[PDB]
Amino acid sequence: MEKLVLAGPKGRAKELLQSLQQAGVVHLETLRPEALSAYQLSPEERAELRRWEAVSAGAEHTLSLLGLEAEPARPFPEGLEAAEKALSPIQAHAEGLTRQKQELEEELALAQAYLEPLERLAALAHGLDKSPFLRVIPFLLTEKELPLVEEALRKALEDRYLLAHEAYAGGVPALVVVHRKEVDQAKAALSRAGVAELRLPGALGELPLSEAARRLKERAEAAPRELSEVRQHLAKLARESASTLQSLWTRAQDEVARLKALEELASGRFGFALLGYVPVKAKPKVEEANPPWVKPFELLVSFLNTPKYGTFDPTPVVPIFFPFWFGMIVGDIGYALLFYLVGRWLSGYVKRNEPLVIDLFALKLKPPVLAKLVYILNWMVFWTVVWGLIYGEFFGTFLEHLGVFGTPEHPGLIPILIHRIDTAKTANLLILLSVAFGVVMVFAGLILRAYLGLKHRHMAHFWEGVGYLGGLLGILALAASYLGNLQAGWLSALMYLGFGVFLLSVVMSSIWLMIPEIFTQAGHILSHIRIYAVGAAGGILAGLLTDVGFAMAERLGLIGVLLGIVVAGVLHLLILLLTTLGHMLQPIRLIWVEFFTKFGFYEENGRPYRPFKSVRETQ
Amino acid sequence: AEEAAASGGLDRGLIAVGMGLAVGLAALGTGVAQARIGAAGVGAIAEDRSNFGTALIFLLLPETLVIFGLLIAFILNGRL
Amino acid sequence: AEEAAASGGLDRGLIAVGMGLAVGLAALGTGVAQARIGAAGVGAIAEDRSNFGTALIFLLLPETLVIFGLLIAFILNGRL
Amino acid sequence: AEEAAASGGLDRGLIAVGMGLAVGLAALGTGVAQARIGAAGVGAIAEDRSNFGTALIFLLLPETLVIFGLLIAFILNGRL
Amino acid sequence: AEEAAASGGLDRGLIAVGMGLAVGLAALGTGVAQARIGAAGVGAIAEDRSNFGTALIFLLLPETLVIFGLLIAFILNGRL
Amino acid sequence: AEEAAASGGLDRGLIAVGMGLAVGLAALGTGVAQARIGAAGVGAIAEDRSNFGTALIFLLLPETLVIFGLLIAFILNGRL
Amino acid sequence: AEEAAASGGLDRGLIAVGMGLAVGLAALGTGVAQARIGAAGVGAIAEDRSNFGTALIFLLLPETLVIFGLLIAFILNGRL
Amino acid sequence: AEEAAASGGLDRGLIAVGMGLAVGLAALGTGVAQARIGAAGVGAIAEDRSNFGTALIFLLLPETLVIFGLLIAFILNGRL
Amino acid sequence: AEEAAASGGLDRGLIAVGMGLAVGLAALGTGVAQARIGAAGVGAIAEDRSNFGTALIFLLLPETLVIFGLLIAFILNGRL
Amino acid sequence: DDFAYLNARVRVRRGTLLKESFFQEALDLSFADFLRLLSETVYGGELAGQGLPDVDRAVLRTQAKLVGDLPRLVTGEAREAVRLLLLRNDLHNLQALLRAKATGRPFEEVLLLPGTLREEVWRQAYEAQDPAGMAQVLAVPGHPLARALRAVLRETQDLARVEALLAKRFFEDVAKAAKGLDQPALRDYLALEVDAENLRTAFKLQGSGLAPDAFFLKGGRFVDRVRFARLMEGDYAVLDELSGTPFSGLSGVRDLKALERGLRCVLLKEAKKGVQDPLGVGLVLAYVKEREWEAVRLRLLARRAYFGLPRAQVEEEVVC
């Protein structure tokens, strides 16, 4: 049989063992870390690992040069010998092509800059730059500097110096021509003004001007043609063999990871460890073992199966999000109506963007792999837009009517004149309807919170978690005495007094050394109420901006207003989007009050495992 | 007051003065938070694209404050 | 009920200024208080993604003042 | 005020202005105390995850001020 | 008053005076916040000559508040 | 003003309106005074664990500023 | 904008006060917004002579608040 | 219209008060803005001792906002 | 005034508005002062334990101002 | 102005700072394995050659783009506050530059990175042919280190003296400006930098027969003229009375190497607890000490590995 080595954590010893036991692997026996010692890699093993890193790196190097890097999930099993022989010709060829290319590009950059001055300068003293009798010194002057330089030279060098200049479109390249042995004096004069000698890089700088000028003119013409070719040969090599490198990269990487695995396991850096045996047949088999609701749930099953604390499933989160999330969309005239269209561009395809190619083949701004992952997300968006179109007629219950309100289904001048969601009675009930769901979520998090300390068997969490839920009851009690006054809520004016005893009476049994801090527990209660209220009311506000964007905001309303309002409407669209996206972050802002405060959830101030925001990114 | 299609009245007018303070102040606080974070978000994406998502989430958060100040204000004036 | 009008009144206008202080001032303190936390939050996620939970809890924390202020304004203005 | 929900006297409107200040301003002060200390607490977690608590105890102290504003408003509008 | 109102007089005028406070304060918070970041932002444009744009977009974000608040005053001051 | 019950004379109203200025301005002052020492105060512990006590005892002193402002307000309000 | 009789009137004053506010307030926000970014940005051209074009496009983004306020102000309080 | 309260009574009174706010605020936002550019500008004259002309013109740019607010108010009350 | 019945005064109500200013501003100011010495005190222990006394003597001084303010408010209003 | 964007840009950067556990790994590695490790880091990202000249260069160039680009990104009141920190790295360039003009030696073999004075300011200064002109070219960025230079240059043209009076006058200049830009975090640190400088001036010039009052400049915490005079006689009993300061750790120590090691570790510590004050200059303060100290350990670990030096000779100097 094949020997196989296993690791896991101490906490899941039994759950890991049961799963492995089932999977294919048989003869599972535990091993403590002292047993794992002395099975650290021999020097030969470390040399294979070093070499596997070179191949990994070496591909990253070749593949980056050649063009773009792409990491596939497709390796190609090969030897040490096979992988290194593959890599050596292409890296060599490509290294060589990129070097030419850099030299070609630097030469162009200098030649493009300095051809016109050197031409001018060479011309001025033509055939007198290679004479020993006369000395030439080139230098650049701006219009501003030219008088100062001339004065300085003239006093220094009398009237037996020659200052000539010729233009080039902007300043003047100037040449001063002086006798041999009058060089020091000539220089000294330039140095006092702050002007210094122009010399180019390499052989050209050192060559007579006439040679330097002829050659620069030649390099500017030649380089762009040769650059084109080198870039072409390099493109072909990527095109044909970018895959070869990518497949070496993946394979090489798998071997590096395997040998690293054995060095870690060997130093007794995994707490629960197993040894077992699999026949050759069993070896694959071990590795082997309404859409809105079902679809995200089947991917979440992978997190059902790995618990980490006294926590329960992270799955209650998704159906709390959905009603509240759909009800941020409530327009029906140029808000939800426009947004319908948006859905199709993410769940179909567009080419009206540049960084985004065709979505149907998985090509977006986001990385090509990430884009294939967020298909599910894009669907979950599509389901949100759809349901929002329905809750846009729910809103139009409170608008449209031919007798209850003073605005028809569609007036014949312009659709929508004045909104009729400005009735006082109508706004309050839609806010109070919304509040009721926030309350349901307060009970559900703290009831699980208690069950958490019961099955994690820390009484200090149980006791604190039970007590805080008493305060909700007081909070609601007190509200009723003010929402109904004494006409209603005189059925909770006496229970409230005792509701207050419950908040503190269980919490004190754990003692606790910050009694004030209970104020902040009451803060969390309050938020679920305010956020659901903001979710309705701020949602409704979204619609009331659309008054002046695709509704009467010109004349008294008339036929012309229909096609006149669209001036302001388009300008209004980007403004509208930004504030309504702000509301859609409320579901997650709500979730995190409870989730990261260990209300039947994994998190509690830090600790591995993602925020649900990132989970839902892909699901 | 009212906000059905007009809000005319000397009495209502008094309510209008009262509410605009609350909008004012709430909007003022939003300005300091949103801008500072938005600049902070542009630095995050530029160094590391592994924090591009955090930068975006932070931007949205101060938007709730300015809407709160509008909503109270609407409420006292004839509701939504 | 709690905080509503439909007709306005001279009494209401003075009531409106008073309720307006609470939401307006609280949100100004929420905005600044967040803003500083928000700057520091770039740093929390950046060092380690094992303090990233902590940064989220800090950000939620200055909201309590504004929520509290909405509540005082509704209560005072809807108790008989 | 103690009596204000949909109508009330001119007089009642005036107590509501003055008392309104006291709470609103506490929220304001809480937020300034929170801004500085909160921002410091983000440094502490970043360095060491385990002493999130020290930051929290220092922070717990300005909450007391918001609660103090509430009580001034409560007593002066009308005794319980 | 406005060209989309047809109610003027003393009555519209109190509302216009009073509601005017809100936009002015929304502009103040926006103002102070846009300016600080914008100055630091010059260095941003200086560095990123191909991603210069990012800097430009972050500036636009506080403006969103001022303009949104004008539109709210527009509704309130004329809806006919 | 009145302590128990809401104000029912214009004079009682006017006093309430003034007295508010003292508890508000104080309330704010407790807030700012806490922040500089409070933010540092974490630092106290950090540097020297033993002299964590030294930071707290300083922070406590601004709490005094609000209670002194309340006492004047509590007495003065009841009668004209 | 204009002064006349047909861009003038008593009727026009009620419009004029509201619309006048719009330039003032937009002006307020613009001055502070523009100052820091403009202070630093002129400075860049002094240091580095390749940022001057960038500085000019950048400069107009805070100018946008006054230009916006101005369009509202002008049209509504135009002729008729 | 003009600023009066006896050449149009109560209707007029509102225009006069509201318009004063546009100018007053135009003046505040400009005033502070001038300081920022001035402060930065010192560096520019020290650095480049002949780019005196650049500092003076940059400074001029906030003055534009007071000439804008102060005239608008003046034209409108100039009608009568 | 008293909370009990034994005072009345038309004059006194006006005295309360004016006096609310003095207490409130003195507590604001005393607090801001207090903080600087308290942060400074953090430094004092750090520099040398023995001269905790130096922090103590300076720190007494802003207290005098609020205390003085409380007595002034009682004399002007509440003496009877 | 303002540190709002700038602090934020640095917070992302504090993510790619080198933690203690890297230097722990690096000591166990040979030079070949060190080189593979180094390349993971951001200093590694500027690497250009396996050998020693190339390691010194990759380190320096990392510091040039991530730390030396900070004063440009702010202006005014922000810029003066950040600038004072940057100025110490600029003084190091200046002292070497001033010395290349004066003793006639080439431009080369000096420290160059951007900070407050750019690369071009140092080239234009180099090529200046009158010390007074050299000085106006330096005065162009604006900073207190010009104003400090300018006064010393009026008294003298002697190399050794300009170096000492510039440094003394410069920390005195720094201190007054810094006190006026406030914040408790900066003040505590400033005090330590001056106290450390005072001790250190006394050590470098030890036993030269000179005045001990010349080694004490204002900004102190617990040190004075008498401790300096005793120290100058060679007595280290003064450091054994020095507690209530974080230099409590210098007690019972009498080696110059242990003493000076001690001061650098103390300054590191103050700055590392300034992250409980990240507002304003506090965070940047912590960021500069850490980038500097990090860069230093990779250079020492690289030297230690290349020449096969003893482990304990460097294991102690790569931790505080």
Helix (H, G, I), strand (E, B) or coil at A179: strand
| Six token digits for residue A483 | 């929402």
Torsional sign, CA H44, H46, H47, H50? positive
Task: Find, in chain F, the residue whose alpha carbon is nearest to that of J269.
Answer: F47
Is the CB of residue D39 less than 8 Å away from at least one CB of chain J? yes
Chains F and E touch (3+ CB pairs under 8 A): no
Identify the burial level of A52 via C-beta atoms within 10 angstroms of its C-beta, where 0-12 means exposed, 13-18 middle and 19 or more buried.
buried
Task: Find, in chain E, the residue whose alpha carbon is nearest to that of A554.
Answer: E4
Provide, as residue numbers in chain J, all residues whose Cβ is less than 8 Å from the Cβ of E41.
5
Q: Tell me how close the Cα of H39 comes to any Cα of chain J, in angstroms.
A: 7
- Please compute Rg for chain A using Cα positions: 39
Residues A518, A522, A523, A524, Cα dihedral to 10°: 110
Helix (H, G, I), strand (E, B) or coil at C9: coil
Q: Tell me how close the Cα of J58 comes to any Cα of chain B, in angstroms.
A: 19
> Look-up: residue for tokens 């939003």?
B30
Is the CB of residue C59 less than 8 Å away from at least one CB of chain D? no
d(CA A470, CA A580): 35
| Count of residues making up chain C | 80
Is the CB of residue B62 less than 8 Å away from at least one CB of chain E? no
d(CA A255, CA J120): 51
DSSP letter, residue E36: H
Is the CB of residue A406 less than 8 Å away from at least one CB of chain D? no
- List, in order, residues 6 or more apart from G14 with CB less than 8 Å away: E1, E8, E9, E12, E13, E16, H11, H14, H15
In a domain, residue H3? The reply is: no
| Count of residues making up chain E | 80
Is the CB of residue A538 less than 8 Å away from at least one CB of chain C? no
Domains along chain J? 1-75+280-320 (1.10.132.50), 76-181 (1.20.1690.10), 182-279 (1.20.1690.10)
Provide, as residue numbers in chain C, all residues whose Cβ is less than 8 Å from the Cβ of J278.
39-40, 43
d(CA J267, CA H27): 48
Q: How far apart are the first and last CA of chain J?
A: 35
Provide, as residue numbers in chain E, all residues whose Cβ is less than 8 Å from the Cβ of H5.
none
Q: Are F20 and D20 in contact (CB under 8 A)?
A: yes
Chains H and E touch (3+ CB pairs under 8 A): yes
d(CA J47, CA J34): 13
d(CA J58, CA J42): 9
- DSSP for A193-245, please give it: HT------SHHHHHS-HHHHHHHHHHHHHHHHHHHHHHHHHHHHHHHHHHHHH
Continuous segment of H or E residues that includes residue J42:
none
Residues H18, H23, H27, H30, Cα dihedral to 10°: 100
Report H helices in chain I. 10-47, 52-60, 63-76
In a domain, residue I70? The reply is: yes
Is the CB of residue B68 less than 8 Å away from at least one CB of chain C? yes
Q: What is the extent of the structural domain holding G47?
A: 8-80
d(CA D37, CA I35): 13
A60-99 exposure pattern, b = at least 16 Cβ within 10 A, e = fewer = ebbbebbeeeeeeeebeebeeeebbebbeebbebbeebee
- List, in order, residues 6 or more apart from A303 with CB less than 8 Å away: A313, A314, A315
Nearest to J99 by CA among J144, J170, J162: J162
Up-side HSE of residue D29: CA atoms within 13 Å toward CB? 35
Is the CB of residue E44 less than 8 Å away from at least one CB of chain J? yes
Interchain CB distance below 8 Å, F36 and D31: no
CB-closest option in I3, I5, I24 to F69: I24
- Named by the residue before each, gaps in chain H exceeding 2.5 A from C to N are none
d(CA C22, CA C75): 12
Helix (H, G, I), strand (E, B) or coil at H66: helix
Between vectors from CA J125 to CA J155 and to CA J116, what angle results, nearest 5°? Answer: 95
Interchain CB distance below 8 Å, B40 and J15: no
Q: Are A188 and A161 in contact (CB under 8 A)?
A: no
| Six token digits for residue E70 | 């004008």
Q: Are D23 and F28 in contact (CB under 8 A)?
A: no
> Look-up: residue for tokens 């104000």?
F7
D22-58 exposure pattern, b = at least 16 Cβ within 10 A, e = fewer = bbbbbbbbbbbbbbbbbbbbbbbbbbebeebebbbeb
Nearest to A477 by CA among A460, A457, A491, A456: A491
In a domain, residue B74? The reply is: yes
- Long-range residue pairs from A12-21, CB within 8 A, at least 24 positions apart, any chain: A12/A272, A12/A306, A13/A272, A15/A307, A16/A272, A17/A274, A20/A274, A20/A276, A20/A286
In a domain, residue E1? The reply is: no
DSSP letter, residue A546: G
d(CA A186, CA A177): 9
Contacting partners of chain B (3+ CB pairs under 8 A): A, C, E, J
In a domain, residue F3? The reply is: no
Quote the distance between the C-alpha of residue J29 and its chain's center.
29
Interchain CB distance below 8 Å, J140 and H39: no
Q: If you count DSSP H runs as helices and E runs as strands, how many of each does chain J have, helices first?
A: 14, 0
- Can you give the three-state secondary structure of A62-89, one letter per residue? HHHHHCCCCCCCCCCCCCHHHHHHHHHH
> Look-up: residue for tokens 């979505």?
A359
d(CA A40, CA A60): 29
Q: Are A461 and A612 in contact (CB under 8 A)?
A: no
Q: Could you give the strand order of the β-sheet that contains A134-141, starting from the edge strand earlier in sequence?
A: A134-141, A172-179, A162-165
Up-side HSE of residue F54: CA atoms within 13 Å toward CB? 25
Q: Tell me how close the Cα of I67 comes to any Cα of chain J, in angstroms.
A: 28
In a domain, residue H32? The reply is: yes
d(CA I62, CA I33): 7
d(CA A502, CA G63): 58
d(CA J76, CA J142): 11
Q: What is the CATH number of the domain that holds E46?
A: 1.20.20.10
Continuous segment of H or E residues that includes residue C1:
none
Interchain CB distance below 8 Å, B40 and J13: no
Is the CB of residue J129 less than 8 Å away from at least one CB of chain A? yes
In a domain, residue I44? The reply is: yes
Provide, as residue numbers in chain E, all residues whose Cβ is less than 8 Å from the Cβ of A545.
68, 71
| Residues forming beta bridges with residue A604, ordered by sequence position | A597
Identify the burial level of F74 via C-beta atoms within 10 angstroms of its C-beta, where 0-12 means exposed, 13-18 middle and 19 or more buried.
middle
Is the CB of residue F37 less than 8 Å away from at least one CB of chain D? no
Nearest to J283 by CA among D42, A273, A77, E30: D42
> Look-up: residue for tokens 């004012």?
B24
In a domain, residue E55? The reply is: yes
| Residues forming beta bridges with residue A5, ordered by sequence position | A275
| Count of residues making up chain D | 80
Helix (H, G, I), strand (E, B) or coil at A493: coil
Backbone angles phi, psi at A141, to 5 degrees: -140, 150
d(CA E60, CA A563): 28
d(CA I41, CA F58): 9
J contact test, residue of G42, G45, G47 with most J CBs within 10 A:
G47
Interchain CB distance below 8 Å, B24 and E26: yes
Is the CB of residue G37 less than 8 Å away from at least one CB of chain H? no
| Six token digits for residue A337 | 């109506």
| Six token digits for residue J6 | 């700038």
Q: Are E42 and G45 in contact (CB under 8 A)?
A: no
Q: Are F73 and F22 in contact (CB under 8 A)?
A: yes
- Structural resolution in Å: 6.4
- List, in order, residues 6 or more apart from J175 with CB less than 8 Å away: J190, J194, J218, J219
Interchain CB distance below 8 Å, E40 and J72: no
Q: Are C48 and D44 in contact (CB under 8 A)?
A: no
- Cα–Cα distance list, A225 to A98, A107, A148, A212, A218 (Å): 16, 13, 43, 21, 12
Q: Where are the beta strands (DSSP E) in D1-80?
A: none
Among residues 158-177 of chain J, which lie with CB inside 8 Å of chain A?
Answer: none
d(CA A505, CA A97): 79
| Residues forming beta bridges with residue B25, ordered by sequence position | none
Is the CB of residue E59 less than 8 Å away from at least one CB of chain G? yes
d(CA J196, CA J173): 17
Identify the burial level of I57 via C-beta atoms within 10 angstroms of its C-beta, where 0-12 means exposed, 13-18 middle and 19 or more buried.
exposed
Chains C and J touch (3+ CB pairs under 8 A): yes
- DSSP for H32-57, please give it: HHHHHHHHHHHHHHHHSTT-HHHHHH
d(CA J29, CA H13): 85
d(CA I27, CA F27): 8
Is the CB of residue E68 less than 8 Å away from at least one CB of chain A? yes
Up-side HSE of residue A437: CA atoms within 13 Å toward CB? 21
Continuous segment of H or E residues that includes residue A140:
strand A134-141
d(CA F38, CA F60): 10
Which amino acid is present at A262?
L
Provide, as residue numbers in chain E, all residues whose Cβ is less than 8 Å from the Cβ of B73.
22
Q: Tell me how close the Cα of C61 comes to any Cα of chain A, in angstroms.
A: 9
Interchain CB distance below 8 Å, J129 and A191: yes
Where residue A14 falls (left for φ over 0; alpha for ψ -120 to 50; beta otherwise) is alpha
CB-closest option in D1, D32, D76 to F77: D76
d(CA J71, CA D6): 59
Interchain CB distance below 8 Å, J12 and B48: yes
Q: If you count DSSP H runs as helices and E runs as strands, how many of each does chain G have, helices first?
A: 2, 0
Q: Tell me how close the Cα of D58 comes to any Cα of chain C, in angstroms.
A: 14
Q: Could you give the strand order of the β-sheet that contains A26-30, starting from the edge strand earlier in sequence?
A: A2-8, A272-278, A26-30
Torsional sign, CA A275, A280, A281, A284? positive
Q: Where are the beta strands (DSSP E) in A412-545?
A: none
Nearest to J27 by CA among J320, J302, J307: J302
- The total number of structural domains in chain H stands at 1
Continuous segment of H or E residues that includes residue A280:
none
- Please compute Rg for chain B using Cα positions: 18
Quote the distance between the C-alpha of residue A560 and its chain's center.
45
Is the CB of residue A547 less than 8 Å away from at least one CB of chain E? yes
Interchain CB distance below 8 Å, A424 and C67: no
d(CA A154, CA E27): 63
Nearest to J175 by CA among J191, J162, J164: J191
